[PDB]
From a paper:
The genus Enterovirus within the Picornaviridae, a family of non-enveloped viruses with a positive single-stranded RNA genome, is comprised of more than 100 serotypes. Human enteroviruses (EV) are presently classified into four groups, Enterovirus A-D (EV-A, B, C, and D), among which EV-B, the largest group, consists of over 60 serotypes, including all 6 serotypes of coxsackievirus B (CVB1-6), coxsackievirus A9 (CVA9), over 30 serotypes of echoviruses and more than 20 newly identified enteroviruses. The capsid proteins (VP1, VP2, and VP3) adopt the classical eight-stranded anti-parallel β-barrel configuration with the N-termini residing inside and the C-termini exposed on the surface. Most of the uncoating receptors bind to the “canyon” sites of the viral particle, dislodging the “pocket factor” in VP1 and subsequently triggering conformational changes of the intact particle to release the genome, albeit that SCARB2 binds EV71 outside the canyon.
Given that three key structural elements of the VP1 GH, VP2 EF, and VP1 EF loops dominate virus–receptor interactions, we systematically calculated pairwise Euclidean distances between all amino acids for all possible (n2) pairs of these three key elements from 15 structure-available human EVs, which defines a k (k = (n2)) dimensional space delineating the structural characteristics of the receptor-recognition sites. The phylogenetic tree could clearly separate these human EVs into three groups: EV-A, EV-B, and EV-C. Within each group, viruses with distinct receptors were further grouped into mono-phylogenetic clades. This structure-based in silico analysis completely matches the results of experimentally derived receptor identification, therefore, it can be used to deduce the receptor usage for human EVs. To test the robustness of our structure-based algorithm, we determined the structures of three other human EVs (CVB1, CVB5 and Echovirus 3) and put these into our algorithm. The in silico analysis suggests that CVB1 and CVB5 are CAR-dependent human EVs and E3 utilizes FcRn as a functional receptor, predictions consistent with experimental reports.
Numbering used by the authors:
A (entry chain B), E (entry chain B): 8 to 261
B (entry chain C): 61 to 238
C (entry chain A), F (entry chain A): 13 to 278
D (entry chain D), G (entry chain D): 2 to 12, 25 to 69
The structure:
């Protein structure tokens, strides 16, 4: 072992290599594995698809402004339109997978900032109006980032999610969000963040279009900054890889 | 930009709207207008067939305060020139970030029905494409020039071969040089 | 040959065989099974049609010189060198110091010329192609004393049969042929600079042995070299600008490659 | 002196005799393949393994 | 082995120590050695001179401008006037040596650039006019750098060498000049470049004034650059050391 | 291998080797000794003149192209293919995937043309038949640079001797030749559909090496293929309608068989 | 390599040598006869004997 700060990951067809990174946080202490034949209840045979599904699908990018609050994604839904993971997701009826989340954000030695890369299992949300429940087009984007705000929510539109960043939108203390697995991105000494998450859920296999497994949240606790005479555009990107996929219950598409 | 050394460096910027493309070209050693002249393109023109892999190396040559990530995709031919970044991310790719041994090597594997291929441009035995997209912007502190270039190397792997020796069409003579 | 491939599984360690430094002048050694997960396929190919033994040992034209039968100066001569044709010149300039044998071959041809006599009946013609090393006698006509060939090697061949062929050892002064020379010939460092300073190689003469006729015939010989037992050292990049002089390296600067209408255009 | 050697098969034998005095009358050494890439690729002094990082 | 990036070289009387450097590229795979008595044809006895000839003779310096094209040197001739290597070069008639080329170019972390340090064996050149051949005062400098240009050559002066950098002046593709041994100088992560070259030539021992062995070429593929407020002068220097020298055929000087 | 026969006696059992069902796609296996009582005769014949090794390995004409000696465009060329003659085409279309070698042969001929000169005395002529694989140089006249043949294989032959012959390995891209192709060439499924989508095979050039004469001579070459080591897969029914296109299967529908004037007429 | 094999008699020996490097310079394999009819006639799955009735 020489020069700890360099990693390398070759999963299937893609490879992501960082030179300046921290350690790798591996789930709750387990590596994602297939489903044993002692805990299954499906009566069909599964379908370990290919290397063609365990790949590195990169999602959209965004700009880290100087007033931005935070973004998030829904994991089983963000990869709905990507390659052969989005075809075996809708043609079948069941499935279980694990992911390998990644994040890139690189700045010079004259910038500053921080971020909290964390994934929350079973993330709920709260509508703006108390009586109603949130919409769907205001809860999940089509692999495009959803963003928090500074003002709380207003009183509209009776279905919008409440983007109150200091409460996280779930109704908890934002400082206590370090229980779920995570990693910090400090531009002083960091350039990325890796996270390996297994499949955590009550039932053995669950639908993909009806119930979202996890939720990826990004929150900058310390805003960007820089003196005059430097690049004012700092973008962010994320790369995710389905790990150990399986399916059951073949039907027509939807 | 062909009668100078500016035809060797890819220009990289620092821009607002992400997902900008940096470069791209089809994959055809000895056939395309980019690889038909390099060290592998001048040896591959003496033959007619070939089969193997290719190692493409890069080298970010910006200042030591520069930063950024990049994507490198190779989409086999069923439908080429992916317009968006999300169209290219489905194929084979890799994610490279700069700084402290910046140079990264993408390995174009060998994926073809037949065993060999034609150096000439043959529509039956096409190869694929190659592209690179902005995974994250180029951020820089103040008092640093933002325009930074990159050099792109190319080489052959160890499962490579050739066949059917022929004569190259580059050199052409008109009369005996007195 | 070529080598096989090996089966790879998903990994999350810190091996990173991708990121390296290119400043060290070291080509990488990454195979496809290192960067992604692949199958196991055993290659049965073989790198045989590319070795220098198989790549160079083919005959090619070098020089064709003709000589009429009309007058007392019919004979024609040629000074040995290999940089007179473009095809075989550039197939040498990918190395610096070679070492080989040769198998000569002369495809002689004939043709008639206008005349006024009533009938014509030309018997077969014969040659008579001589070789004069450097520093030796020389002929000046087709009826000279030099054509005896008491020690020179000659070849006599009658038209109508197979062409003549023969071998040649590694005849040189140094331990290997030199295709590029950097330096002059005079110790005062003046005068001739190029590669022909260390190239003499002798001469080559040809002649009709028949007395005369009524045509009279005209002929053209064609040489063919075939390097047999090659050995190459110190490769170098191929040529990019056309040849324009026989004993120089003068060129005219051109673009490095043809052009496309964009950087992102396919 | 006759040698019964192998032939070039896709995936047998073939005889051969020499008839002259010199050595420049034999045929080419086509059936010889010897490779060594280390001279041109990787001429460095310190040996570098692809697992460890390049420069520290 | 600790902190790879530091080397140290003590050859004879001089010592050159760099703290930030890349690996060392050693010829075609051989270390320079003396001439065995199985491949010699000289009938005299050689003269292994001293440690006084295997030393570090530093040549002239130059400025890396923002429009410069490239420089070069001729190796057996550049050391003609340096110390006891230039006396045993002209008093004798034969000789064979190997060199240890070095290069220094150091800039801050706010500059950028690159260079190709390569040595070519048996480097020819092309005159401007096609008929004539190049001069000598336009082909070799007296240990002063010769430089390429941007405009091609013109048509003068019927003897000038053609300084067409993109063709290298030899008549080949400049991108293919990585076959001969070499090393890059990237100011981002590099500060020097070392190269050990053995004696490569057809004959065993060759003259020194009539035939030049090698040629050292420097070409910046990426020009220098810097924002306002930094030192605008970046000089370059080179240090060379004859290795394993030998001579024969003593006569008068010339 | 053929088999013998066996002696049979009268029977009255329920063996019934005659009645069977033909719906099962099974050809019967009844011999004459099963249906009637016969003698015992041991056959000494042998099925040797019918195997594919002996049935295909005979030379046949493929294409004869001629080239005059008059002008600077005398040379003639041909694109390789085997579906240009009716005799050898139909002897291939009883199988689908073949695999063989070949032994070429060129029976060259000559002839005079009208002229006005007083006398004529034509020495022997020579060729010079070249082979250009796909994706290579090409000649355009009889005095071009391409005729050097630095790597191309050529054959030189003087008129009056035996004809030239040579072998050819299994040069292809797939694991066996394909005589029938069902599908297009473009992935968009548009344009060319027939069998020539996977047939290039190179070219073939011929030329007079002699300078010129007074005739001047005209010549015609004739090719001859001979598949040597055959292997056939997937037989199919022979052809019933004439050939009418070189790279198609277009036909004109005809009757299945000639006609007789009755059903019971002999 | 010479083999002394048999000849084609109605109802002796004959020598043979190869002189080249490749395998495409030998003569045809005329003296080879191998028959198998089961692939084209009788491709059925269940084996049918001619004594028993065809379909039950
Ligand atoms: C009748 C027999 C005559 C034999 C003539 C021998 C010809 C010698 C060939 C010289 C080698 C070819 C030149 C190599 C290097 C050079 O000089 O450019
Ligand atoms: C002087 C030597 C020349 C040798 C020329 C080789 C000719 C190649 C023959 C190709 C195989 C015949 C075609 C089979 C299938 C098809 O393409 O229809
Ligand atoms: C001039 C050679 C004539 C043809 C050869 C006939 C065979 C004679 C025996 C040769 C044995 C030589 C030893 C060996 O096998 O290498
Ligand atoms: C080039 C071949 C010359 C004619 C053959 C003469 C006999 C030489 C001995 C050959 C024995 C080879 C082994 C064998 O019998 O197969």
């Amino acid at each position: 072992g020489y020069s700890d700060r360099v990693r390398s990951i070759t999963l299937g067809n893609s490879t992501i290599t960082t030179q300046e990174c921290a350690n790798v946080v591996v789930g709750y202490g387990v590596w994602p594995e297939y489903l044993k034949d002692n805990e299954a209840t499906g009566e069909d045979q599964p379908t370990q698809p290919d290397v063609a599904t365990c790949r590195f699908y990169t999602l959209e990018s965004v700009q880290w402004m100087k007033n931005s609050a935070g973004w998030w994604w829904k994991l089983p839904d963000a990869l709905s339109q990507m390659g052969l993971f989005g075809q075996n997701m809708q043609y079948h009826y069941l499935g279980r997978t694990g992911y390998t989340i990644h994040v890139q954000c690189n700045a010079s030695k004259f910038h500053q900032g921080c971020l909290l890369v964390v994934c929350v299992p079973e993330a709920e949300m709260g509508c703006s109006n108390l009586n109603n429940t949130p919409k769907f087009a205001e809860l999940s984007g089509g692999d495009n980032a959803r963003m928090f705000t500074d003002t709380e929510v207003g009183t509209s539109n009776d279905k919008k999610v409440q983007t109150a960043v200091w409460n996280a939108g779930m109704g908890v203390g934002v400082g206590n969000l370090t229980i779920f697995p995570h990693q910090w991105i400090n531009l002083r000494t960091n350039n990325s963040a890796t996270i390996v998450m297994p499949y955590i859920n009550s039932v053995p296999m669950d639908n993909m279009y009806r119930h979202n497994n996890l939720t990826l949240m990004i929150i900058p606790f310390v805003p960007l900054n820089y003196s005059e005479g430097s690049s004012p555009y700092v973008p962010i990107t994320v790369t995710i890889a389905p790990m150990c996929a399986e399916y059951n219950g073949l039907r027509l598409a939807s | 930009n062909v009668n100078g050394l500016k035809a060797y460096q890819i220009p990289v910027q620092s821009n607002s709207d992400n997902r900008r493309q940096v470069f791209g070209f089809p994959l055809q050693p000895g056939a395309n207008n980019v690889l038909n002249r390099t060290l592998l393109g001048e040896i591959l023109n003496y033959y007619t067939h070939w089969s193997g892999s290719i190692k493409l190396t890069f080298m970010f040559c910006g200042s030591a305060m520069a930063t950024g990530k990049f994507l490198l995709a190779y989409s086999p031919p069923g439908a080429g020139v992916p317009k968006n970044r999300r169209d290219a991310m489905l194929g084979t790719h890799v994610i490279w970030d700069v700084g402290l041994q910046s140079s990264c090597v993408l390995c174009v594997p060998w994926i073809s029905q037949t065993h060999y291929r034609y150096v000439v441009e043959d529509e039956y035995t096409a190869a694929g494409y190659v592209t690179c997209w902005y995974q994250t912007n180029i951020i820089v502190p103040a008092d640093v020039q933002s325009t930074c270039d990159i050099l792109c190397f190319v080489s052959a792997c160890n499962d490579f071969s050739v066949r059917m020796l022929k004569d190259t069409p580059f050199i052409r003579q008109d009369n005996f040089y007195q | 040959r070529v080598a096989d491939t090996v089966s790879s599984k998903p990994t999350n360690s810190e091996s990173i065989p991708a990121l390296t430094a290119a400043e060290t002048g070291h080509t990488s050694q990454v195979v496809p099974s290192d960067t992604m997960q692949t199958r196991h396929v055993k290659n049965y190919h073989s790198r045989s049609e590319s070795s220098i033994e198989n790549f160079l040992c083919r005959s090619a034209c070098v020089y064709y010189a003709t000589y009429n039968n009309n007058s007392e100066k019919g004979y024609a001569e040629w000074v040995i060198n290999t940089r007179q044709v473009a095809q075989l010149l550039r197939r040498k300039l990918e190395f610096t110091y070679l070492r080989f044998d040769l198998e000569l071959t002369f495809v002689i041809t004939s043709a008639q010329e206008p005349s006024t006599a009533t009938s014509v009946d030309a018997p077969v013609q014969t040659q008579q192609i001589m070789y004069v090393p450097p520093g030796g006698p020389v002929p000046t006509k087709v009826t000279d004393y030099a054509w005896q060939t008491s020690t020179n090697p000659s070849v006599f061949w009658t038209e109508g049969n197979a062409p003549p062929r023969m071998s040649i050892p590694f005849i040189s002064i140094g331990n290997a042929y030199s295709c590029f020379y950097d330096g002059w010939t005079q110790f005062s460092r003046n005068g001739v600079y190029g590669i022909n300073t260390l190239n003499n190689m002798g001469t080559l003469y040809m002649r009709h042995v028949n007395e005369a006729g009524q045509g009279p015939i005209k002929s053209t010989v064609r040489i063919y070299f075939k390097p047999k037992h090659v050995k190459a050292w110190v490769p170098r990049p191929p040529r990019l600008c056309q040849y324009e002089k026989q004993k120089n390296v003068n060129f005219n600067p051109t673009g490095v490659t043809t052009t496309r209408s964009n950087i992102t255009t396919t | 002196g006759a040698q019964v050697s192998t032939q070039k098969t896709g995936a047998i034998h073939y005889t051969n005799i020499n008839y002259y005095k010199d050595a420049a009358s034999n045929s080419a050494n086509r059936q010889d393949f010897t490779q060594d890439p280390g001279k041109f690729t990787e001429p460095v002094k310190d040996i570098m393994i692809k697992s460890m990082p390049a420069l520290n």
